Amino acid sequence: MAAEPLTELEESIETVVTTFFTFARQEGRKDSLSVNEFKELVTQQLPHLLKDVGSLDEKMKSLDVNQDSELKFNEYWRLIGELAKEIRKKKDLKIRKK
Amino acid sequence: MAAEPLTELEESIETVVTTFFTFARQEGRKDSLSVNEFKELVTQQLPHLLKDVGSLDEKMKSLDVNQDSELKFNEYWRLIGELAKEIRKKKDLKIRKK
Numbered sequence: 001m002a003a004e005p006l007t008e009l010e011e012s013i014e015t016v017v018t019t020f021f022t023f024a025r026q027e028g029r030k031d032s033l034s035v036n037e038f039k040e041l042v043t044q045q046l047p048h049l050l051k052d053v054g055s056l057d058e059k060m061k062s063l064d065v066n067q068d069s070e071l072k073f074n075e076y077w078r079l080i081g082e083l084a085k086e087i088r089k090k091k092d093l094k095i096r097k098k
Numbered sequence: 099m100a101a102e103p104l105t106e107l108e109e110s111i112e113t114v115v116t117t118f119f120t121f122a123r124q125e126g127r128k129d130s131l132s133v134n135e136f137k138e139l140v141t142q143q144l145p146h147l148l149k150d151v152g153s154l155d156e157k158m159k160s161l162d163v164n165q166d167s168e169l170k171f172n173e174y175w176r177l178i179g180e181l182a183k184e185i186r187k188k189k190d191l192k193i194r195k196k
């Protein structure tokens with residue numbers, strides 16, 4: 001249950017786990033991310049990527065599909081895809097040259 | 099349209115796009131990934147992350163859900179979740195510390 005660096009492509013997915021899981025372990029489950037801390041991370045360390053830092057209720061409901069307490073990686077996975085999808089095409093209509 | 103470096107967390111998921119997009123551009127849709135080249139990426143530059151390199155069809159069928167011979171980021175999204183999930187708890191039975 002510990003992410004170690006190996007190759008350039010394997011290190012990218014490892015950097016996202018090793019950087020925020022140090023604070024996510026504070027609440028229940030080691031592999032699960034907190035419901036109150038992920039909202040603060042998207043408005044402090046990840047604000048430029050996801051334009052809707054305040055309007056996160058659309059994804060917040062889609063993430064916790066089982067509805068327990070926190071966002072497990074299987075539940076948080078809905079934002080992991082939007083992380084690399086909104087990086088190049090957050091507004092593919094007005095701005096298309098980054 | 100293209101992916102450019104940003105913050106520590108945003109740059110990790112951003113680098114994964116720019117590394118494989120250099121070879122994915124040759125096939126249809128720049129944002130979409132090929133069904134043969136992505137399989138070769140796991141058996142050359144990502145073999146240690148995904149322990150099951152031979153039987154890739156188990157995830158391949160879950161990726162191309164639309165059935166159009168093109169793995170868009172919405173289709174490839176299922177492997178992005180399994181990439182970061184099969185790094186710390188790949189074999190949660192025999193080994194649980196790396």
Ligand SMILES: CC(C)c1ccc2oc3nc(N)c(C(=O)O)cc3c(=O)c2c1
Nearest residue numbers: 001002003017018019020021022025030
């Ligand atoms: C990848 C990094 C953020 C990470 C992820 C999961 C972790 O799960 C652990 N389990 C433990 N019981 C103890 C401990 O017993 O101190 C500590 C940790 C980690 O340091 C630990 C570190």
Ligand SMILES: CC(C)c1ccc2oc3nc(N)c(C(=O)O)cc3c(=O)c2c1
Nearest residue numbers: 088099100101115116117119120128129
């Ligand atoms: C830095 C270089 C290797 C690179 C990396 C990712 C890229 O992602 C893009 N996205 C797009 N939709 C289109 C496009 O709409 O034409 C083109 C590209 C790139 O040229 C492109 C170029």
